[PDB]
Protein backbone atom coordinates (compact mmCIF):
# COMPACT_ATOMS: atom_id res chain seq x y z
CA UNK A 1 0.00 0.00 0.00
CA UNK A 2 1.30 3.44 -1.07
CA UNK A 3 -0.03 5.15 2.09
CA UNK A 4 1.73 2.73 4.47
CA UNK A 5 4.83 2.83 2.24
CA UNK A 6 4.77 6.65 2.52
CA UNK A 7 3.97 6.63 6.28
CA UNK A 8 6.72 4.04 6.91
CA UNK A 9 9.34 5.98 4.93
CA UNK A 10 8.56 9.34 6.60
CA UNK A 11 8.82 7.74 10.06
CA UNK A 12 12.25 6.34 9.17
CA UNK A 13 13.27 9.66 7.59
CA UNK A 14 12.05 11.40 10.77
CA UNK A 15 14.23 9.32 13.10
CA UNK A 16 17.15 10.02 10.71
CA UNK A 17 16.38 13.74 10.70
CA UNK A 18 16.19 13.71 14.55
CA UNK A 19 19.63 12.08 14.81
CA UNK A 20 21.38 14.12 12.10
CA UNK A 21 19.42 17.10 13.43
CA UNK A 22 21.02 16.69 16.88
CA UNK A 23 24.48 16.34 15.38
CA UNK A 24 24.11 19.35 13.09
CA UNK A 25 22.58 21.68 15.72
CA UNK A 26 25.58 21.20 18.03
CA UNK A 27 27.96 21.79 15.11
CA UNK A 28 26.06 24.93 14.01
CA UNK A 29 25.64 26.37 17.55
CA UNK A 30 29.06 25.80 19.07
CA UNK A 31 30.93 28.95 18.15
CA UNK A 32 27.98 31.23 19.03
CA UNK A 33 28.20 32.87 22.48
CA UNK A 34 25.15 32.20 24.70
CA UNK A 35 24.30 29.10 22.66
CA UNK A 36 22.88 26.35 24.88
CA UNK A 37 22.12 23.87 22.13
CA UNK A 38 25.71 22.58 22.33
CA UNK A 39 25.81 18.96 23.62
CA UNK A 40 24.37 15.89 21.82
CA UNK A 41 22.04 14.41 24.46
CA UNK A 42 20.08 17.68 25.07
CA UNK A 43 20.25 18.55 21.35
CA UNK A 44 18.49 15.24 20.62
CA UNK A 45 15.78 16.08 23.16
CA UNK A 46 15.59 19.51 21.48
CA UNK A 47 15.01 17.76 18.11
CA UNK A 48 12.12 15.70 19.50
CA UNK A 49 10.64 18.87 21.14
CA UNK A 50 10.85 20.63 17.77
CA UNK A 51 9.49 17.88 15.50
CA UNK A 52 6.49 17.50 17.82
CA UNK A 53 6.04 21.33 18.27
CA UNK A 54 5.70 20.87 22.04
CA UNK A 55 7.18 24.29 22.74
CA UNK A 56 8.88 24.24 26.13
CA UNK A 57 11.51 26.81 25.14
CA UNK A 58 14.12 25.29 27.37
CA UNK A 59 16.42 25.04 24.31
CA UNK A 60 16.46 26.72 20.90
CA UNK A 61 18.99 27.58 18.24
CA UNK A 62 20.40 31.14 18.21
CA UNK A 63 22.26 30.86 14.82
CA UNK A 64 21.30 30.88 11.16
CA UNK A 65 22.31 27.27 10.51
CA UNK A 66 20.92 26.03 13.82
CA UNK A 67 17.61 27.67 12.80
CA UNK A 68 17.79 26.11 9.31
CA UNK A 69 18.29 22.75 11.01
CA UNK A 70 15.30 23.52 13.28
CA UNK A 71 13.11 24.10 10.18
CA UNK A 72 14.10 20.81 8.52
CA UNK A 73 13.25 19.06 11.81
CA UNK A 74 9.84 20.87 12.09
CA UNK A 75 8.97 20.09 8.48
CA UNK A 76 10.03 16.44 8.81
CA UNK A 77 7.86 16.09 11.95
CA UNK A 78 4.96 18.00 10.38
CA UNK A 79 5.23 16.08 7.07
CA UNK A 80 5.34 12.66 8.76
CA UNK A 81 2.30 13.47 10.91
CA UNK A 82 0.32 14.55 7.84
CA UNK A 83 1.33 11.34 6.02
CA UNK A 84 0.39 9.16 9.04
CA UNK A 85 -2.98 10.91 9.46
CA UNK A 86 -3.66 10.67 5.71
CA UNK A 87 -2.69 6.94 5.79
CA UNK A 88 -5.02 6.35 8.76
CA UNK A 89 -7.81 8.10 6.83
CA UNK A 90 -7.18 5.96 3.73
CA UNK A 91 -7.25 2.81 5.85
CA UNK A 92 -10.49 3.70 7.63
CA UNK A 93 -12.22 4.92 4.44
CA UNK A 94 -11.39 1.73 2.50
CA UNK A 95 -12.46 -0.39 5.48
CA UNK A 96 -15.72 1.51 6.02
CA UNK A 97 -16.54 1.17 2.33
CA UNK A 98 -15.93 -2.59 2.51
CA UNK A 99 -18.06 -2.62 5.68
CA UNK A 100 -20.86 -1.34 3.41
CA UNK A 101 -20.21 -3.95 0.69
CA UNK A 102 -19.29 -1.10 -1.69
CA UNK B 1 -17.04 1.04 12.91
CA UNK B 2 -13.24 0.55 12.94
CA UNK B 3 -12.55 4.31 12.84
CA UNK B 4 -14.73 5.07 15.88
CA UNK B 5 -13.37 1.95 17.61
CA UNK B 6 -9.84 3.27 16.97
CA UNK B 7 -10.73 6.89 17.92
CA UNK B 8 -12.50 5.68 21.10
CA UNK B 9 -9.57 3.46 22.17
CA UNK B 10 -6.91 6.16 21.59
CA UNK B 11 -8.94 8.68 23.64
CA UNK B 12 -9.14 6.19 26.52
CA UNK B 13 -5.44 5.32 26.11
CA UNK B 14 -4.69 9.07 26.11
CA UNK B 15 -6.43 9.72 29.44
CA UNK B 16 -4.53 6.69 30.82
CA UNK B 17 -1.23 8.00 29.45
CA UNK B 18 -1.98 11.47 30.98
CA UNK B 19 -2.58 9.92 34.42
CA UNK B 20 0.31 7.43 34.38
CA UNK B 21 2.34 10.17 32.69
CA UNK B 22 1.81 12.49 35.69
CA UNK B 23 2.72 9.75 38.13
CA UNK B 24 5.85 8.69 36.25
CA UNK B 25 7.16 12.25 35.62
CA UNK B 26 7.17 13.00 39.37
CA UNK B 27 8.90 9.68 40.06
CA UNK B 28 11.51 10.31 37.32
CA UNK B 29 12.15 13.98 38.23
CA UNK B 30 12.33 13.86 42.02
CA UNK B 31 15.99 13.20 42.68
CA UNK B 32 17.14 15.73 40.04
CA UNK B 33 18.16 19.14 41.44
CA UNK B 34 16.28 22.08 39.86
CA UNK B 35 13.47 19.76 38.80
CA UNK B 36 10.08 21.50 39.04
CA UNK B 37 8.00 18.68 37.63
CA UNK B 38 7.77 17.13 41.11
CA UNK B 39 4.16 17.23 42.44
CA UNK B 40 1.17 15.34 40.95
CA UNK B 41 -1.34 18.16 40.34
CA UNK B 42 1.08 20.35 38.27
CA UNK B 43 2.58 17.24 36.63
CA UNK B 44 -0.92 16.36 35.37
CA UNK B 45 -1.33 19.87 33.95
CA UNK B 46 2.14 19.41 32.41
CA UNK B 47 0.89 16.17 30.75
CA UNK B 48 -2.11 17.94 29.20
CA UNK B 49 0.18 20.81 28.03
CA UNK B 50 2.47 18.25 26.41
CA UNK B 51 -0.12 16.01 24.73
CA UNK B 52 -1.73 19.10 23.18
CA UNK B 53 1.68 20.72 22.27
CA UNK B 54 0.50 24.05 23.71
CA UNK B 55 4.03 25.05 24.69
CA UNK B 56 3.89 27.37 27.67
CA UNK B 57 7.23 26.21 29.07
CA UNK B 58 6.16 26.75 32.63
CA UNK B 59 7.10 23.10 33.36
CA UNK B 60 9.28 20.55 31.58
CA UNK B 61 11.27 17.46 32.48
CA UNK B 62 15.04 17.88 33.04
CA UNK B 63 15.88 14.10 33.23
CA UNK B 64 16.25 11.25 30.78
CA UNK B 65 13.24 9.29 32.06
CA UNK B 66 11.12 12.41 32.52
CA UNK B 67 11.89 13.23 28.85
CA UNK B 68 11.07 9.65 27.77
CA UNK B 69 7.75 10.03 29.58
CA UNK B 70 7.23 13.39 27.81
CA UNK B 71 7.68 11.65 24.41
CA UNK B 72 5.15 8.90 25.16
CA UNK B 73 2.69 11.64 26.19
CA UNK B 74 3.38 13.69 22.99
CA UNK B 75 3.02 10.63 20.77
CA UNK B 76 -0.18 9.51 22.53
CA UNK B 77 -1.67 13.01 22.07
CA UNK B 78 -0.43 13.26 18.47
CA UNK B 79 -1.59 9.71 17.62
CA UNK B 80 -5.08 10.21 19.10
CA UNK B 81 -5.55 13.50 17.22
CA UNK B 82 -4.57 11.84 13.92
CA UNK B 83 -7.00 8.97 14.61
CA UNK B 84 -9.83 11.39 15.52
CA UNK B 85 -9.22 13.53 12.41
CA UNK B 86 -9.00 10.42 10.22
CA UNK B 87 -12.25 9.09 11.79
CA UNK B 88 -13.98 12.44 11.16
CA UNK B 89 -12.79 12.28 7.54
CA UNK B 90 -14.10 8.72 7.13
CA UNK B 91 -17.46 9.75 8.58
CA UNK B 92 -17.84 12.80 6.36
CA UNK B 93 -16.65 10.98 3.21
CA UNK B 94 -19.08 8.08 3.67
CA UNK B 95 -21.90 10.53 4.44
CA UNK B 96 -21.13 12.77 1.46
CA UNK B 97 -21.06 9.74 -0.82
CA UNK B 98 -24.45 8.63 0.49
CA UNK B 99 -25.64 12.23 0.02
CA UNK B 100 -24.84 11.65 -3.68
CA UNK B 101 -26.64 8.28 -3.82
CA UNK B 102 -23.29 6.62 -4.58
Amino acid at each position, epitope marked *: ALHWRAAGAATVLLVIVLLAGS*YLA*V*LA*E*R*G*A*P*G*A*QL*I*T*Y*PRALWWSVETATTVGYGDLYPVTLWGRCVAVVVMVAGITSFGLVTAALATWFVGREQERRGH | ALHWRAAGAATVLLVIVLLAGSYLAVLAERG*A*P*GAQLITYPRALWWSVETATTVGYGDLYP*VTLWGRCVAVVVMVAGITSFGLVTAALATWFVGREQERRGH
Partner: antibody
Amino acid sequence: QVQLQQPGAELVKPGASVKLSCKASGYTFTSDWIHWVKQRPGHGLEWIGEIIPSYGRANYNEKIQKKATLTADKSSSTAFMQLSSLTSEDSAVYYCARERGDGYFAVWGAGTTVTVSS
Amino acid sequence: DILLTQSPAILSVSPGERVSFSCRASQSIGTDIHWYQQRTNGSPRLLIKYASESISGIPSRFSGSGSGTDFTLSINSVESEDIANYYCQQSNRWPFTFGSGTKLEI
Protein backbone atom coordinates in the same frame (compact mmCIF):
# COMPACT_ATOMS: atom_id res chain seq x y z
CA GLN C 1 46.62 2.81 28.07
CA VAL C 2 47.48 6.56 27.71
CA GLN C 3 44.59 8.12 25.76
CA LEU C 4 46.20 11.42 24.58
CA GLN C 5 49.90 11.82 23.72
CA GLN C 6 51.68 15.18 23.69
CA PRO C 7 55.37 16.16 23.48
CA GLY C 8 56.91 17.19 26.81
CA ALA C 9 58.49 20.40 25.57
CA GLU C 10 58.80 22.94 22.79
CA LEU C 11 61.26 25.85 22.75
CA VAL C 12 60.30 28.77 20.55
CA LYS C 13 62.02 32.10 19.82
CA PRO C 14 60.15 35.39 20.32
CA GLY C 15 58.19 36.07 17.11
CA ALA C 16 58.48 32.44 15.96
CA SER C 17 55.74 29.80 15.48
CA VAL C 18 55.20 26.23 16.81
CA LYS C 19 52.76 23.46 15.93
CA LEU C 20 51.74 21.29 18.89
CA SER C 21 50.35 17.78 18.57
CA CYS C 22 47.96 15.55 20.45
CA LYS C 23 47.79 11.91 19.34
CA ALA C 24 44.66 10.09 20.44
CA SER C 25 43.82 6.44 21.13
CA GLY C 26 41.13 4.44 22.97
CA TYR C 27 37.45 4.68 21.95
CA THR C 28 36.94 7.21 19.16
CA PHE C 29 33.61 8.56 17.89
CA THR C 30 32.86 10.99 15.02
CA SER C 31 31.14 13.08 17.69
CA ASP C 32 34.34 13.67 19.76
CA TRP C 33 35.89 17.10 20.30
CA ILE C 34 39.52 17.91 21.11
CA HIS C 35 39.99 20.97 23.31
CA TRP C 36 43.13 22.96 24.07
CA VAL C 37 43.69 24.52 27.48
CA LYS C 38 46.50 26.89 28.56
CA GLN C 39 48.06 27.09 32.04
CA ARG C 40 50.70 29.77 32.84
CA PRO C 41 52.98 28.68 35.76
CA GLY C 42 51.26 29.28 39.12
CA HIS C 43 47.97 30.16 37.36
CA GLY C 44 44.61 28.65 36.36
CA LEU C 45 43.22 26.80 33.36
CA GLU C 46 42.22 28.81 30.30
CA TRP C 47 40.16 27.48 27.43
CA ILE C 48 41.72 28.17 24.02
CA GLY C 49 39.53 26.41 21.48
CA GLU C 50 38.00 23.15 20.32
CA ILE C 51 37.91 21.07 17.13
CA ILE C 52 35.63 18.38 15.77
CA PRO C 53 38.30 16.35 13.89
CA SER C 54 35.81 14.26 11.89
CA TYR C 55 34.48 17.51 10.35
CA GLY C 56 37.39 19.99 10.62
CA ARG C 57 35.25 22.71 12.25
CA ALA C 58 37.07 24.70 14.97
CA ASN C 59 35.94 27.33 17.49
CA TYR C 60 38.10 29.73 19.51
CA ASN C 61 38.00 31.67 22.80
CA GLU C 62 37.11 35.07 21.33
CA LYS C 63 37.82 36.81 24.68
CA ILE C 64 41.62 36.44 24.31
CA GLN C 65 44.14 37.38 21.62
CA LYS C 66 43.93 34.77 18.83
CA LYS C 67 47.31 32.99 18.74
CA ALA C 68 45.96 29.53 17.90
CA THR C 69 44.81 27.68 14.80
CA LEU C 70 43.44 24.16 15.15
CA THR C 71 43.64 21.36 12.62
CA ALA C 72 43.35 17.55 12.64
CA ASP C 73 44.59 14.47 10.79
CA LYS C 74 41.77 11.91 10.75
CA SER C 75 44.00 9.02 9.52
CA SER C 76 46.68 9.34 12.23
CA SER C 77 44.05 10.76 14.66
CA THR C 78 46.27 13.66 15.71
CA ALA C 79 45.04 17.11 16.73
CA PHE C 80 47.25 20.08 15.97
CA MET C 81 47.43 23.52 17.45
CA GLN C 82 49.40 26.00 15.40
CA LEU C 83 50.61 28.76 17.72
CA SER C 84 52.08 31.77 15.89
CA SER C 85 54.00 35.02 16.59
CA LEU C 86 54.61 34.09 20.21
CA THR C 87 55.84 36.41 22.95
CA SER C 88 56.69 35.41 26.56
CA GLU C 89 53.06 35.86 27.61
CA ASP C 90 52.58 32.70 25.53
CA SER C 91 54.93 30.62 27.71
CA ALA C 92 52.88 27.97 29.49
CA VAL C 93 51.84 24.32 29.61
CA TYR C 94 49.30 23.61 26.85
CA TYR C 95 47.04 20.60 27.47
CA CYS C 96 44.80 18.85 25.01
CA ALA C 97 41.66 17.11 26.30
CA ARG C 98 38.94 14.89 24.85
CA GLU C 99 35.21 15.67 25.09
CA ARG C 100 32.47 13.22 24.03
CA GLY C 101 30.16 16.14 23.10
CA ASP C 102 28.65 16.00 26.59
CA GLY C 103 30.46 18.95 28.17
CA TYR C 104 33.22 17.55 30.37
CA PHE C 105 36.83 16.63 29.74
CA ALA C 106 37.08 12.94 30.49
CA VAL C 107 40.75 12.57 29.48
CA TRP C 108 43.69 14.99 29.26
CA GLY C 109 47.18 14.78 27.80
CA ALA C 110 50.22 15.31 30.01
CA GLY C 111 50.79 18.75 28.51
CA THR C 112 53.43 20.44 26.39
CA THR C 113 55.63 22.97 28.15
CA VAL C 114 56.21 25.78 25.68
CA THR C 115 58.99 28.20 26.60
CA VAL C 116 59.39 31.37 24.53
CA SER C 117 62.98 32.71 24.68
CA SER C 118 66.07 33.46 22.56
CA ASP D 1 30.03 34.49 29.01
CA ILE D 2 29.54 32.55 32.22
CA LEU D 3 31.81 33.59 35.03
CA LEU D 4 32.52 31.03 37.74
CA THR D 5 33.64 32.27 41.10
CA GLN D 6 35.48 29.97 43.47
CA SER D 7 35.64 30.73 47.20
CA PRO D 8 37.85 30.80 49.03
CA ALA D 9 41.06 30.77 46.92
CA ILE D 10 42.79 28.75 49.68
CA LEU D 11 41.08 26.28 52.03
CA SER D 12 43.01 25.13 55.13
CA VAL D 13 41.57 22.09 56.87
CA SER D 14 42.53 19.42 59.44
CA PRO D 15 43.10 15.77 58.46
CA GLY D 16 39.87 13.78 58.63
CA GLU D 17 37.53 16.80 58.49
CA ARG D 18 34.83 17.23 55.79
CA VAL D 19 35.79 20.02 53.34
CA SER D 20 33.66 21.98 50.85
CA PHE D 21 34.74 23.97 47.77
CA SER D 22 32.39 26.62 46.42
CA CYS D 23 31.65 27.52 42.84
CA ARG D 24 29.14 30.27 42.04
CA ALA D 25 27.96 30.87 38.46
CA SER D 26 27.03 34.33 37.06
CA GLN D 27 23.72 33.01 35.78
CA SER D 28 21.58 29.88 36.19
CA ILE D 29 23.25 26.83 34.56
CA GLY D 30 21.15 23.87 35.79
CA THR D 31 23.62 21.24 37.02
CA ASP D 32 26.01 21.63 34.03
CA ILE D 33 29.10 21.92 36.21
CA HIS D 34 32.07 19.52 36.42
CA TRP D 35 34.99 19.29 38.84
CA TYR D 36 38.68 18.62 38.33
CA GLN D 37 41.61 17.93 40.61
CA GLN D 38 45.08 19.06 39.61
CA ARG D 39 47.94 17.95 41.85
CA THR D 40 51.44 19.51 41.71
CA ASN D 41 52.96 19.16 38.20
CA GLY D 42 50.14 16.74 37.22
CA SER D 43 47.35 17.25 34.69
CA PRO D 44 43.69 17.80 35.68
CA ARG D 45 41.58 14.80 36.51
CA LEU D 46 37.78 14.66 36.36
CA LEU D 47 36.26 14.04 39.79
CA ILE D 48 32.58 14.86 39.41
CA LYS D 49 30.46 15.53 36.36
CA TYR D 50 27.04 17.25 36.19
CA ALA D 51 27.23 18.71 39.73
CA SER D 52 26.91 15.36 41.57
CA GLU D 53 27.54 12.41 39.24
CA SER D 54 30.39 10.17 40.38
CA ILE D 55 33.23 9.12 38.09
CA SER D 56 34.68 5.58 38.04
CA GLY D 57 37.89 5.16 40.01
CA ILE D 58 37.44 8.31 42.10
CA PRO D 59 37.32 7.80 45.90
CA SER D 60 33.78 7.56 47.32
CA ARG D 61 34.57 10.46 49.68
CA PHE D 62 34.35 13.04 46.86
CA SER D 63 30.82 14.25 46.22
CA GLY D 64 29.11 17.22 44.62
CA SER D 65 25.89 19.16 45.04
CA GLY D 66 24.06 22.21 43.75
CA SER D 67 21.98 23.54 40.91
CA GLY D 68 21.33 26.87 39.23
CA THR D 69 24.13 29.14 40.34
CA ASP D 70 25.54 27.56 43.56
CA PHE D 71 27.76 24.43 43.52
CA THR D 72 29.82 22.59 46.09
CA LEU D 73 32.47 19.91 45.95
CA SER D 74 32.79 18.06 49.20
CA ILE D 75 35.48 15.73 50.50
CA ASN D 76 34.69 13.52 53.47
CA SER D 77 37.66 12.80 55.72
CA VAL D 78 40.36 14.79 53.92
CA GLU D 79 43.78 13.19 53.63
CA SER D 80 47.20 14.03 52.23
CA GLU D 81 46.62 12.87 48.64
CA ASP D 82 43.79 15.45 48.48
CA ILE D 83 46.29 18.32 48.59
CA ALA D 84 45.67 19.91 45.18
CA ASN D 85 44.08 22.69 43.14
CA TYR D 86 40.37 22.19 42.40
CA TYR D 87 38.54 23.75 39.45
CA CYS D 88 34.92 23.90 38.31
CA GLN D 89 33.90 24.13 34.66
CA GLN D 90 30.52 24.78 33.00
CA SER D 91 29.08 23.40 29.83
CA ASN D 92 25.72 25.17 29.90
CA ARG D 93 26.46 27.86 27.34
CA TRP D 94 29.10 28.42 24.69
CA PRO D 95 31.98 28.93 25.45
CA PHE D 96 32.94 26.48 28.19
CA THR D 97 34.61 28.26 31.09
CA PHE D 98 36.64 27.34 34.18
CA GLY D 99 36.62 28.74 37.71
CA SER D 100 39.88 30.19 39.06
CA GLY D 101 40.57 27.32 41.44
CA THR D 102 40.79 26.54 45.12
CA LYS D 103 43.92 25.16 46.70
CA LEU D 104 43.52 22.60 49.47
CA GLU D 105 45.99 22.89 52.31
CA ILE D 106 46.14 20.49 55.22
